[PDB]
Amino acid sequence: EVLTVFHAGSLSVPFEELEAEFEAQHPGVDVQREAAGSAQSVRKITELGKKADVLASADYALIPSLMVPEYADWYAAFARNQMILAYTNESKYGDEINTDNWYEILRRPDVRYGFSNPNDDPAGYRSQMVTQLAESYYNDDMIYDDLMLANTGMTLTTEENGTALIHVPASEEISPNTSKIMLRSMEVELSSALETGEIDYLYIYRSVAEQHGFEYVALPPAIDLSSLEYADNYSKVQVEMVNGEVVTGSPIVYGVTIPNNAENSELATEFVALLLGETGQQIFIENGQPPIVPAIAEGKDSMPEELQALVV
């Protein structure tokens, strides 16, 4: 039989490992994964009329926003990403750097750091969010100014409600000081630059750092966008992109559901049980995407009995 799984691209490595283990436990089963962007994966079900047994989004909130109640009765937040500061043995002051002093290292004139385009890449605007949130955490109101405002065409205003608003101009108008910053649209250019020592530090997800074998500084959960419990702190920063669209600091949390129109719901239950259980947990730990344990569910009383045992 066949199990159809639509998942976010960033879930590819762990879901590959899940496919292998699930097929090893279930001989006759053919797991057919489709990797795409999270919103695209959801739209396949909600707009294109495609049938999937499992839907996994890199933004859990897309499930209640777009699928509930017509296509989903429940969802579970099961893992997260986290913003880190990646480096290598070639990075200046790598021996010194830690969670307490990372921004002080970045302040040094000879240190160069990379981040993605904040207009086009979530990792890009997230680099700005994390840096701004650092100010309240470390009691230093010049971190964002020194690192970003002084070296780019990005600006900052304070909204009437106390929220920090970062303004990103046209990509060609960001015009970074290249002695301090490497800014790229394609993240692989930045990871390559870190590998060769062209940059010293790189704002990227933990998953990416671990995949490349980079060292990294773990950042406080209050600022690193990893934790559901710090959602109200993350929301204290917003980023306005050139087009006018505004994004808000929020947890980077993965969500899963079995769609209401799944063709093999019973088999889907067993797959999600593997994902939420000890096997899936370790797989996600190993890919730098820490699991939420137990997973946090909405619509728990509408979930299969087997899955209810695996959620809060």
Technique used: X-ray
Q: Note whether 177 and 86 are same-domain residues.
A: yes
CB 274 within 8 A of CB 266: no
277 and 232 within one domain? no
Report how far apart, in Å, the C-alpha atoms of 185 and of each of 68, 123, 129, 294 are.
Answer: 34, 10, 18, 36
Tell me whether residue 13 is exposed, middle or buried, using C-beta atoms within 10 angstroms of its C-beta: 0 to 12, 13 to 18, 19 or more.
middle
Name 77's Cβ contacts closer than 8 Å, sequence gap at least 6: 60, 228, 253, 254, 255, 292, 295, 296, 297
Burial class (CB in 10 A: 0-12, 13-18, 19+), 115: buried
Q: How far, in Å, CA of 66 to CA of 43, rounded?
A: 8
C-alpha angle 262-263-265 in degrees, rounded to nearest 5 = 60
Helix (H) or strand (E) holding 247: strand 246-248
Indicate whether 282 and 306 sit together in one domain: yes
> 144: closest CA among 87, 103, 172, 204?
103
Chain Cα centroid distance, residue 75: 18
In whole angstroms, give the CA distance from residue 63 to residue 42.
8
Q: Of 201, 228, 252, which closes a domain?
A: 252
Q: Which of 207, 232, 252 is the last residue of a domain?
A: 252
End-of-domain residue from the set 252, 278, 300: 252
Q: Which domain holds residue 291?
A: 1-80+253-312
Pick the closest to residue 114 from 175, 51, 189, 168 (CA basis). 189
Residue 31's φ and ψ, nearest 5 degrees, are -80, 120
Domain match, 105 and 202 both: yes
In this structure, the answer to whether residues 242 and 258 fall within a common structural domain is no
| 41 neighbors 50 (Cβ within 8 angstroms) | no
Domain match, 96 and 222 both: yes
Say yes or no: 150 and 234 in one domain: yes
CATH no. for residue 30?
3.40.190.10
Calpha distance 112→164 (Å, rounded): 25
For residues 65 and 155, membership in a common domain is answered with no
Number of continuous H segments (helices) and E segments (strands) in the chain: 13, 15
Specify whether 195 is located in the same domain as 287. no
Instruction: Examine the domain organization and report whether 92 and 232 are in the same domain.
Output: yes
Question: Do residue 121 and residue 150 come from a single domain?
Answer: yes
Domains: count for the chain: 2
Say whether both 115 and 237 belong to one domain: yes
